[PDB]
């Protein structure tokens, strides 16, 4: 068990970076941050602004 594989090698490390910022800022998962950043040309600011606007409700805040 526990063994990396990786498929395609084209913009991953960087992507992660942002993803991390997203999964951290927002609190979503990577896969999500990857989908959000994937629709934001890999732009956290956008992904965030996008995800945020599109679904603004935490676990317990107000």
From Swiss-Prot:
Which residues does the UniProt record annotate as the domain UBA? 8-56
Where's it found, cell-wise? Nucleus
Function in brief: Ubiquitin-binding adapter that links a subset of NEDD8-associated cullin ring ligases (CRLs) to the segregase VCP/p97, to regulate turnover of their ubiquitination substrates.
Complex and partners: Interacts with neddylated CUL2, ubiquitinated HIF1A, and VCP/p97.
In the record's own words, the domains note is:
The UIM (ubiquitin-interacting motif) is required to engage the NEDD8 modification on cullins.
User: What is the protein name stated in its UniProt record?
Assistant: UBX domain-containing protein 7
Q: Which organism is it from?
A: Homo sapiens (Human)
UniProt lists the gene as: UBXN7
């Amino acid at each position: 068990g526990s063994s990396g594989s990786s498929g395609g090698s084209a913009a991953s490390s960087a992507l992660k970076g942002l993803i991390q910022q997203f999964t951290t800022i927002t609190g979503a998962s990577e896969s999500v941050g990857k989908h959000m950043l994937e629709a934001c040309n890999n732009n956290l600011e956008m992904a965030v602004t996008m995800f945020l606007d599109g679904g603004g409700s935490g676990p317990s805040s107000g």
